[PDB]
């Protein structure tokens, strides 16, 4: 259940302010080589941060 | 005894070489410092959760 937000084009390899289905932060989005299982929505680091 | 002394010395150095190559725990005093600091940082970072 999400509010009436408009989506924007996805931008990679640049510093952006992002919001992914409620997940927010600042960073650089790159293509990943991680093997997410079909049910996994996000991942976390050793530090247990997204 | 110069020849003997040189041989005993050279042999003792070889023993150090082998002892270090074999025993992983020999440098525990330095590894412990590294481990204490690594734990301190991991603890600090985990507190953000």
């Amino acid at each position: 259940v999400c509010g009436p937000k408009k989506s924007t084009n996805l931008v990679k390899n640049k510093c952006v302010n992002f919001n992914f289905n409620g997940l927010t932060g600042t960073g650089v989005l790159t293509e990943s080589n991680k093997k997410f299982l079909p049910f996994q929505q996000f991942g976390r680091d050793i530090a247990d941060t997204t | 005894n110069q020849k003997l002394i040189a041989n005993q010395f050279n042999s003792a150095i070889g023993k150090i070489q082998d002892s270090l190559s074999s025993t992983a725990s020999a440098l525990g005093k330095l590894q412990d410092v590294v481990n204490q600091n690594a734990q301190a940082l991991n603890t600090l970072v985990k507190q953000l959760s």
């Binding site: 680091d45 050793i46 530090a47 941060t49 | 070489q17 270090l20 190559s21 992983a24 020999a26 440098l27 330095l30 590894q31 590294v34 690594a38 940082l41 991991n42 600090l44 970072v45 953000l48």
Partner: peptide, 27 residues
Amino acid sequence: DLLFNKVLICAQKFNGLTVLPPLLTDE
């Protein structure tokens, strides 16, 4: 070399945790 061979950072760094290099390098 034996001493050196015998004796994560991104995850830590990303929280404002940097590591400064020694003034005197191993060399």
